[PDB]
Symmetry: C2
Subunit: 249 residues, 2 copies
């Protein structure tokens, strides 16, 4: 019935991959081409969002082009911003739990909730935990960065998120991070929580995606990675095929 | 199976009443006497907690005495504190969303989560929204007090709580408040959310409990109200009988 239910059902059989498209990075038509190549590569959902703040008209154009060019559901990834498009299928309702500023824990969320209640868009509660180095979202979101290897702090935040009712936990290294969050942190936390763990940031090749998925990530988020659109398919296939080869206990 | 599931099943038939016992106010044995009288009066659950910080030994003694003297489940009501007793059946995992200080939104919660994960206690996610006047918890929790009549701010916080995954919303006027949160605010918010609404603070007589339940509160929280234990039963019966007389659509 819902994207969240689709995710939970899919996790019984395979790891999930999602492709994040930054609407500020390319034109709506180029974004749609990228989305179609990612669909063919086997990605499960398109995420749309970034750190660069843009107007709702551009958000609308990007989401509309993607939905016209693919059969995938589109999930908004607001991060530290209050970006919305009413054309998206779902939105990760994200709380940056390790921010020093209440504005990114509950501020933007409270300001956006009424408008969101007027829309048919699906609201998926997600705990957004920003790890070292954090990159732009770490800076803009005022994160008290969780060190990638500080698995006990990761666990405290993840358990708190679970006990607050969040349905997904997102380990965020930051867009462009040289390396993703530690495998040891991922495995340690995954062994102790009962909601899905998503890892994004610093995953740009099949071997990295494989080691992160094997460490315990339930879903992997990457960009389109390839500079040229005509190379996105081959690049994403190699990644997706690998993580979807893992047998799920 | 769980206290939360018991609550949801009960709400299909009747309004809920819970009796809050402050372990700092009376001796453990007196608390247990109060709990037994409240059980006979028809209360659904015993809540244990307050604003006065106490040692875990006193918490343990109070919860143990109550559980030895009644057949009711005991739910911890930490408020702005990190009070715990391992003898309780459940804990409201409370986030004071309208606090100005992140410490009461996520701070204490992150510090307590690991210990809580070591316990069999049931964790029930609750959004804790403190309204004017707020009393002691409003002061200590550093609340940006929601005016009792500011129904749109109430709605924004309640919808944000729902979209973050909280399972219960608690409208808190503060212990000892002269009047509870406005009926108009309660009805306005209740018409727009899909999780239960709990109202506490300022409810000390049957007519107040009746008007708050009719306005749209799903559960009512009161203290034992009566100065003398031998009068608790009659005082709580009159309240509980009234709110449990409301037909649920």
């Amino acid at each position: 019935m819902t994207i969240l239910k689709q995710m939970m059902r899919k996790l019984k059989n395979e790891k999930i991959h999602m492709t994040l498209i930054d609407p500020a990075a390319k034109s709506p038509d180029e974004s749609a081409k990228i989305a179609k190549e990612a669909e063919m590569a086997g990605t499960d959902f398109i995420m749309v969002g970034g750190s660069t703040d843009i107007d709702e008209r551009l958000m609308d154009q990007t989401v509309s082009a993607i939905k016209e060019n693919t059969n995938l559901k589109v999930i908004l990834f607001p991060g530290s911003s209050n970006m919305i498009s009413r054309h998206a299928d779902a939105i990760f309702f994200m709380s940056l739990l390790n921010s020093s500023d209440r504005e990114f824990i509950v501020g933007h969320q409270v300001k956006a909730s009424k408008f969101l209640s007027l829309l048919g868009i699906e609201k998926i509660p997600m705990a957004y935990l920003v790890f070292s180095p954090g990159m732009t979202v770490g800076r803009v979101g005022k994160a008290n960065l969780i060190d990638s290897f500080d698995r006990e702090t990761a666990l405290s935040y993840s358990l708190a998120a679970q006990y607050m009712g969040f349905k997904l936990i997102y380990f965020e290294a930051g867009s462009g991070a040289p390396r993703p969050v530690s495998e040891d942190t991922i495995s340690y936390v995954k062994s102790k929580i009962n909601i899905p763990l998503i890892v994004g940031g610093g995953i740009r090749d099949p071997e990295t995606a494989m080691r992160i998925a094997l460490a315990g990530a339930d879903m992997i988020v990457t960009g389109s990675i390839a500079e040229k659109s005509n190379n996105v398919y081959s690049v994403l296939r190699n990644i997706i095929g690998k993580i979807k080869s893992i047998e799920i206990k």
